[PDB]
Design a binder for these strands. Sequence first.
DNA 1: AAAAA
DNA 2: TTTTTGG
DNA 3: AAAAAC
Length: 335
Amino acid sequence: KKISQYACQRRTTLNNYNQLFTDALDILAENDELRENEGSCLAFMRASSVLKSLPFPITSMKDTEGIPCLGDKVKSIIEGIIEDGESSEAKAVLNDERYKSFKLFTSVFGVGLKTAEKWFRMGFRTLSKIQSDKSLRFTQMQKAGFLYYEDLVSCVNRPEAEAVSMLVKEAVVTFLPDALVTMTGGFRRGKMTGHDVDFLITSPEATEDEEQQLLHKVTDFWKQQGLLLYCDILQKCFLILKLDHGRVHGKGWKAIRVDLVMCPYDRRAFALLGWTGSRQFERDLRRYATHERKMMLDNHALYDRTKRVFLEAESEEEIFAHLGLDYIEPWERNA
DNA sequence: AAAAA
DNA sequence: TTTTTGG
DNA sequence: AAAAAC
Ligand SMILES: Nc1ccn([C@H]2CC[C@@H](COP(=O)(O)OP(=O)(O)OP(=O)(O)O)O2)c(=O)n1
Ligand SMILES: [Mg+2]
Ligand SMILES: [Mg+2]
Ligand code: NA
Protein backbone atom coordinates (compact mmCIF):
# COMPACT_ATOMS: atom_id res chain seq x y z
CA LYS A 1 0.00 0.00 0.00
CA LYS A 2 1.00 3.70 -0.60
CA ILE A 3 2.94 5.24 2.37
CA SER A 4 1.25 8.42 3.57
CA GLN A 5 3.14 11.74 3.94
CA TYR A 6 1.37 12.07 7.35
CA ALA A 7 2.89 10.45 10.45
CA CYS A 8 -0.70 9.96 11.82
CA GLN A 9 -1.37 7.56 8.86
CA ARG A 10 1.83 5.51 9.57
CA ARG A 11 2.77 2.94 12.26
CA THR A 12 6.16 3.89 13.74
CA THR A 13 7.53 1.44 16.30
CA LEU A 14 10.89 1.67 18.10
CA ASN A 15 12.52 -0.83 15.62
CA ASN A 16 14.30 1.64 13.35
CA TYR A 17 16.07 -0.21 10.43
CA ASN A 18 17.42 3.06 8.97
CA GLN A 19 19.30 4.73 11.89
CA LEU A 20 22.34 5.36 9.58
CA PHE A 21 20.12 7.59 7.41
CA THR A 22 17.89 9.11 10.18
CA ASP A 23 20.87 10.04 12.46
CA ALA A 24 22.31 12.07 9.51
CA LEU A 25 18.90 13.67 8.68
CA ASP A 26 18.36 14.53 12.40
CA ILE A 27 21.77 16.36 12.47
CA LEU A 28 20.93 18.34 9.25
CA ALA A 29 17.48 19.26 10.69
CA GLU A 30 19.08 20.44 13.95
CA ASN A 31 21.54 22.65 12.03
CA ASP A 32 18.63 24.26 10.08
CA GLU A 33 16.83 24.82 13.46
CA LEU A 34 19.92 26.65 14.75
CA ARG A 35 20.20 28.71 11.47
CA GLU A 36 16.41 29.56 11.89
CA ASN A 37 15.68 27.86 8.50
CA GLU A 38 12.28 26.47 9.65
CA GLY A 39 11.24 25.10 6.23
CA SER A 40 14.43 23.12 5.52
CA CYS A 41 14.40 21.94 9.20
CA LEU A 42 10.85 20.60 8.92
CA ALA A 43 11.69 18.84 5.55
CA PHE A 44 14.63 16.97 7.14
CA MET A 45 12.47 16.07 10.24
CA ARG A 46 9.68 14.65 7.96
CA ALA A 47 12.20 12.63 5.87
CA SER A 48 13.78 11.22 9.04
CA SER A 49 10.23 10.41 10.43
CA VAL A 50 9.07 8.52 7.25
CA LEU A 51 12.31 6.42 7.21
CA LYS A 52 11.75 5.51 10.91
CA SER A 53 8.36 3.92 9.82
CA LEU A 54 9.96 1.56 7.21
CA PRO A 55 9.81 -2.20 8.05
CA PHE A 56 13.09 -2.78 6.15
CA PRO A 57 16.53 -1.03 5.73
CA ILE A 58 17.23 1.04 2.55
CA THR A 59 20.07 -0.83 0.72
CA SER A 60 19.78 0.82 -2.79
CA MET A 61 18.34 3.98 -4.40
CA LYS A 62 15.51 1.85 -5.94
CA ASP A 63 14.24 1.26 -2.35
CA THR A 64 13.40 5.01 -2.06
CA GLU A 65 10.83 4.89 -4.97
CA GLY A 66 7.34 5.99 -3.95
CA ILE A 67 8.40 7.03 -0.42
CA PRO A 68 6.97 10.54 0.33
CA CYS A 69 8.91 13.44 2.01
CA LEU A 70 12.07 12.44 0.03
CA GLY A 71 12.90 15.07 -2.51
CA ASP A 72 16.10 15.52 -4.54
CA LYS A 73 18.17 16.97 -1.64
CA VAL A 74 17.21 14.13 0.74
CA LYS A 75 17.81 11.43 -1.97
CA SER A 76 21.34 12.88 -2.53
CA ILE A 77 22.05 12.44 1.23
CA ILE A 78 20.72 8.81 1.16
CA GLU A 79 22.89 8.09 -1.96
CA GLY A 80 26.04 9.31 -0.14
CA ILE A 81 25.34 7.10 2.93
CA ILE A 82 24.72 4.02 0.63
CA GLU A 83 28.13 4.86 -1.03
CA ASP A 84 30.46 4.54 2.04
CA GLY A 85 28.22 4.26 5.17
CA GLU A 86 28.71 7.97 6.09
CA SER A 87 27.09 11.35 5.37
CA SER A 88 29.63 14.02 4.28
CA GLU A 89 26.87 16.70 4.82
CA ALA A 90 26.18 15.60 8.44
CA LYS A 91 30.00 15.25 9.03
CA ALA A 92 30.45 18.96 8.01
CA VAL A 93 27.70 19.99 10.49
CA LEU A 94 29.34 17.89 13.30
CA ASN A 95 32.65 19.76 12.70
CA ASP A 96 31.00 23.25 12.54
CA GLU A 97 31.89 25.48 15.57
CA ARG A 98 28.43 27.17 15.68
CA TYR A 99 26.68 23.76 15.64
CA LYS A 100 28.97 22.33 18.40
CA SER A 101 28.33 25.40 20.64
CA PHE A 102 24.54 25.35 20.08
CA LYS A 103 24.30 21.63 21.02
CA LEU A 104 26.47 22.11 24.12
CA PHE A 105 24.76 25.29 25.35
CA THR A 106 21.15 24.21 24.78
CA SER A 107 21.89 20.92 26.64
CA VAL A 108 21.50 23.12 29.81
CA PHE A 109 17.85 23.33 31.18
CA GLY A 110 16.86 27.01 30.80
CA VAL A 111 19.11 27.69 27.75
CA GLY A 112 17.43 27.88 24.34
CA LEU A 113 18.35 29.02 20.82
CA LYS A 114 18.52 32.80 21.70
CA THR A 115 20.80 32.49 24.82
CA ALA A 116 23.04 29.89 23.03
CA GLU A 117 23.43 32.30 20.02
CA LYS A 118 24.17 35.22 22.42
CA TRP A 119 26.91 33.26 24.29
CA PHE A 120 28.49 32.07 21.00
CA ARG A 121 28.64 35.69 19.67
CA MET A 122 30.27 36.72 23.01
CA GLY A 123 33.06 34.22 22.28
CA PHE A 124 32.10 31.46 24.76
CA ARG A 125 32.86 27.87 23.72
CA THR A 126 32.69 25.82 26.98
CA LEU A 127 30.21 25.45 29.89
CA SER A 128 33.08 25.92 32.43
CA LYS A 129 33.89 29.39 30.95
CA ILE A 130 30.18 30.36 31.01
CA GLN A 131 29.63 29.23 34.68
CA SER A 132 32.80 30.92 36.01
CA ASP A 133 32.21 34.27 34.16
CA LYS A 134 31.83 37.25 36.56
CA SER A 135 29.63 39.46 34.29
CA LEU A 136 27.01 36.88 33.13
CA ARG A 137 23.66 36.75 35.00
CA PHE A 138 21.64 33.54 35.01
CA THR A 139 17.85 33.02 35.21
CA GLN A 140 16.42 30.80 38.01
CA MET A 141 15.78 28.09 35.32
CA GLN A 142 19.48 28.21 34.15
CA LYS A 143 20.78 28.09 37.80
CA ALA A 144 18.81 24.80 38.22
CA GLY A 145 20.00 23.68 34.74
CA PHE A 146 23.67 24.06 35.77
CA LEU A 147 23.23 22.74 39.35
CA TYR A 148 21.55 19.45 38.19
CA TYR A 149 23.33 19.29 34.74
CA GLU A 150 24.94 15.77 35.00
CA ASP A 151 21.67 14.20 36.29
CA LEU A 152 19.49 15.88 33.62
CA VAL A 153 21.93 15.05 30.76
CA SER A 154 22.06 11.31 31.84
CA CYS A 155 18.26 10.87 30.97
CA VAL A 156 15.67 8.73 32.78
CA ASN A 157 15.21 4.93 32.51
CA ARG A 158 11.93 2.87 33.03
CA PRO A 159 12.54 1.92 36.74
CA GLU A 160 13.12 5.67 37.44
CA ALA A 161 9.98 6.70 35.42
CA GLU A 162 7.89 4.12 37.33
CA ALA A 163 9.30 5.31 40.70
CA VAL A 164 8.31 8.91 39.67
CA SER A 165 4.77 7.67 38.71
CA MET A 166 4.36 6.29 42.28
CA LEU A 167 5.49 9.70 43.78
CA VAL A 168 3.05 11.62 41.51
CA LYS A 169 0.10 9.28 42.31
CA GLU A 170 0.85 9.34 46.11
CA ALA A 171 0.90 13.18 46.11
CA VAL A 172 -2.16 13.66 43.82
CA VAL A 173 -4.58 11.19 45.68
CA THR A 174 -3.71 13.03 48.97
CA PHE A 175 -5.65 16.11 47.63
CA LEU A 176 -7.95 14.43 44.99
CA PRO A 177 -8.57 10.72 45.91
CA ASP A 178 -10.67 10.06 42.72
CA ALA A 179 -7.99 11.52 40.36
CA LEU A 180 -6.68 9.55 37.37
CA VAL A 181 -2.93 9.92 36.76
CA THR A 182 -1.55 8.71 33.40
CA MET A 183 2.06 8.67 32.30
CA THR A 184 2.21 10.24 28.83
CA GLY A 185 5.11 11.22 26.50
CA GLY A 186 7.87 8.81 25.40
CA PHE A 187 7.37 6.24 28.15
CA ARG A 188 3.68 5.78 27.14
CA ARG A 189 4.98 5.15 23.56
CA GLY A 190 7.11 2.24 24.93
CA LYS A 191 10.47 4.06 25.18
CA MET A 192 12.96 2.62 27.61
CA THR A 193 14.57 6.10 28.14
CA GLY A 194 13.54 9.77 28.07
CA HIS A 195 14.76 13.32 28.89
CA ASP A 196 11.80 13.72 31.33
CA VAL A 197 8.64 11.96 32.72
CA ASP A 198 5.27 13.49 31.72
CA PHE A 199 1.85 12.97 33.34
CA LEU A 200 -1.78 13.80 32.68
CA ILE A 201 -3.96 14.30 35.77
CA THR A 202 -7.79 14.48 35.63
CA SER A 203 -10.64 14.08 38.15
CA PRO A 204 -14.27 13.09 37.40
CA GLU A 205 -15.70 14.81 40.56
CA ALA A 206 -13.32 17.84 41.16
CA THR A 207 -14.71 21.40 40.96
CA GLU A 208 -13.25 24.24 38.79
CA ASP A 209 -11.40 25.58 41.92
CA GLU A 210 -10.21 22.07 43.05
CA GLU A 211 -8.85 21.48 39.49
CA GLN A 212 -6.99 24.82 39.66
CA GLN A 213 -5.46 24.22 43.14
CA LEU A 214 -4.20 20.60 42.71
CA LEU A 215 -0.78 21.45 41.12
CA HIS A 216 -0.15 24.14 43.80
CA LYS A 217 -1.07 21.66 46.60
CA VAL A 218 1.08 18.79 45.16
CA THR A 219 4.17 21.05 44.64
CA ASP A 220 3.80 22.62 48.18
CA PHE A 221 3.68 19.04 49.61
CA TRP A 222 6.93 18.14 47.74
CA LYS A 223 8.52 21.49 48.82
CA GLN A 224 7.73 20.52 52.48
CA GLN A 225 9.46 17.07 51.97
CA GLY A 226 12.46 18.75 50.34
CA LEU A 227 11.82 17.01 46.96
CA LEU A 228 11.01 20.11 44.86
CA LEU A 229 14.30 21.18 43.24
CA TYR A 230 12.64 23.45 40.60
CA CYS A 231 9.04 24.52 39.88
CA ASP A 232 7.31 26.64 37.21
CA ILE A 233 3.44 26.55 37.14
CA LEU A 234 1.66 27.85 33.98
CA GLN A 235 -2.88 24.21 33.60
CA LYS A 236 0.65 22.68 33.64
CA CYS A 237 3.98 22.69 35.52
CA PHE A 238 7.66 22.05 34.63
CA LEU A 239 9.50 20.53 37.56
CA ILE A 240 12.76 19.03 38.78
CA LEU A 241 12.18 16.43 41.49
CA LYS A 242 14.56 14.74 43.92
CA LEU A 243 14.30 10.95 43.30
CA ASP A 244 15.81 8.95 46.21
CA HIS A 245 17.78 5.82 45.11
CA GLY A 246 15.80 3.70 47.65
CA ARG A 247 12.59 4.26 45.59
CA VAL A 248 14.19 2.79 42.40
CA HIS A 249 14.76 -1.02 42.43
CA GLY A 250 27.06 8.59 45.49
CA LYS A 251 24.73 11.36 46.81
CA GLY A 252 21.89 8.79 47.10
CA TRP A 253 19.40 10.57 44.76
CA LYS A 254 18.88 11.73 41.11
CA ALA A 255 17.38 15.00 39.74
CA ILE A 256 14.47 14.18 37.36
CA ARG A 257 12.65 16.49 34.97
CA VAL A 258 8.86 16.01 35.49
CA ASP A 259 5.95 17.69 33.66
CA LEU A 260 2.39 17.63 35.02
CA VAL A 261 -0.77 18.57 33.09
CA MET A 262 -4.20 19.01 34.78
CA CYS A 263 -7.23 18.96 32.47
CA PRO A 264 -11.06 19.01 32.90
CA TYR A 265 -12.50 15.47 32.92
CA ASP A 266 -14.61 15.90 29.72
CA ARG A 267 -11.46 16.91 27.66
CA ARG A 268 -9.23 14.02 28.93
CA ALA A 269 -9.15 12.16 25.51
CA PHE A 270 -7.90 15.28 23.66
CA ALA A 271 -5.28 15.95 26.37
CA LEU A 272 -4.09 12.29 26.45
CA LEU A 273 -3.74 12.27 22.65
CA GLY A 274 -1.88 15.62 22.60
CA TRP A 275 0.51 14.73 25.42
CA THR A 276 1.33 11.17 24.27
CA GLY A 277 3.14 12.50 21.19
CA SER A 278 5.54 12.08 19.43
CA ARG A 279 5.99 15.78 18.40
CA GLN A 280 5.96 14.70 14.66
CA PHE A 281 2.83 12.57 15.20
CA GLU A 282 1.05 15.59 16.85
CA ARG A 283 2.04 18.12 14.14
CA ASP A 284 0.84 15.72 11.37
CA LEU A 285 -2.44 14.93 13.25
CA ARG A 286 -3.23 18.70 13.29
CA ARG A 287 -1.96 19.17 9.65
CA TYR A 288 -4.09 16.21 8.44
CA ALA A 289 -7.15 17.51 10.38
CA THR A 290 -6.77 20.98 8.71
CA HIS A 291 -5.80 20.03 5.11
CA GLU A 292 -7.62 16.72 4.64
CA ARG A 293 -10.76 17.03 6.84
CA LYS A 294 -11.21 20.84 7.28
CA MET A 295 -11.11 20.18 11.06
CA MET A 296 -9.19 21.91 13.85
CA LEU A 297 -7.54 19.79 16.51
CA ASP A 298 -5.76 20.83 19.71
CA ASN A 299 -5.15 19.39 23.24
CA HIS A 300 -8.67 20.43 24.43
CA ALA A 301 -11.04 19.91 21.47
CA LEU A 302 -11.84 18.86 17.87
CA TYR A 303 -13.77 21.31 15.78
CA ASP A 304 -15.44 20.90 12.35
CA ARG A 305 -14.91 24.21 10.41
CA THR A 306 -17.57 23.38 7.75
CA LYS A 307 -20.33 22.18 10.13
CA ARG A 308 -19.21 24.86 12.71
CA VAL A 309 -19.54 22.26 15.55
CA PHE A 310 -17.28 20.67 18.18
CA LEU A 311 -16.93 16.86 18.07
CA GLU A 312 -17.06 14.97 21.42
CA ALA A 313 -14.82 12.02 22.47
CA GLU A 314 -14.38 9.85 25.61
CA SER A 315 -11.32 7.99 24.16
CA GLU A 316 -8.41 8.42 21.69
CA GLU A 317 -10.11 5.82 19.43
CA GLU A 318 -13.19 8.15 19.07
CA ILE A 319 -10.86 11.07 18.02
CA PHE A 320 -9.16 8.86 15.35
CA ALA A 321 -12.67 7.74 14.16
CA HIS A 322 -13.87 11.42 13.86
CA LEU A 323 -10.78 12.21 11.72
CA GLY A 324 -11.34 9.18 9.46
CA LEU A 325 -8.03 7.61 10.58
CA ASP A 326 -7.17 3.99 11.45
CA TYR A 327 -6.38 3.75 15.17
CA ILE A 328 -2.61 4.00 15.86
CA GLU A 329 -1.52 2.41 19.19
CA PRO A 330 0.65 4.65 21.50
CA TRP A 331 3.74 2.40 20.86
CA GLU A 332 3.13 2.98 17.07
CA ARG A 333 3.27 6.84 17.44
CA ASN A 334 7.12 7.06 17.54
CA ALA A 335 7.24 9.24 14.37
C1' DA B 1 13.31 21.25 1.56
C1' DA B 2 8.98 19.00 0.01
C1' DA B 3 4.23 18.97 -1.59
C1' DA B 4 -0.08 21.55 -1.98
C1' DA B 5 -2.49 25.24 -4.29
C1' DT C 1 5.12 29.36 -10.33
C1' DT C 2 3.55 30.84 -5.12
C1' DT C 3 2.11 29.21 -0.45
C1' DT C 4 2.17 26.20 3.52
C1' DT C 5 4.62 23.83 6.77
C1' DG C 6 0.96 22.40 14.47
C1' DG C 7 -1.30 24.96 17.60
C1' DA D 1 10.83 42.82 28.35
C1' DA D 2 12.55 38.63 25.99
C1' DA D 3 13.13 34.07 26.92
C1' DA D 4 12.35 29.26 28.51
C1' DA D 5 9.64 25.51 29.65
C1' DC D 6 6.23 21.23 26.51
N1 LIG E 1 7.15 20.49 20.27
C1 LIG E 1 6.39 19.60 20.94
C2 LIG E 1 6.95 18.98 22.09
C3 LIG E 1 6.15 18.10 22.83
N2 LIG E 1 4.83 17.84 22.42
C4 LIG E 1 4.00 16.90 23.14
C5 LIG E 1 3.96 15.46 22.56
C6 LIG E 1 4.79 14.67 23.58
C7 LIG E 1 4.56 15.42 24.94
C8 LIG E 1 5.86 15.30 25.74
O1 LIG E 1 6.88 16.15 25.19
P1 LIG E 1 8.41 15.86 25.56
O2 LIG E 1 8.60 15.40 26.97
O3 LIG E 1 9.14 17.13 25.19
O4 LIG E 1 8.84 14.70 24.67
P2 LIG E 1 8.88 13.11 24.65
O5 LIG E 1 8.02 12.51 23.57
O6 LIG E 1 8.11 12.66 25.95
O7 LIG E 1 10.37 12.50 24.48
P3 LIG E 1 11.39 12.31 25.73
O8 LIG E 1 11.02 10.80 26.31
O9 LIG E 1 12.90 12.27 25.24
O10 LIG E 1 11.00 13.26 26.80
O11 LIG E 1 4.28 16.80 24.54
C9 LIG E 1 4.32 18.46 21.26
O12 LIG E 1 3.16 18.22 20.85
N3 LIG E 1 5.12 19.35 20.54
MG1 LIG F 1 8.93 13.50 27.62
MG1 LIG G 1 7.96 16.80 28.76
NA1 NA H 1 18.05 24.04 27.07
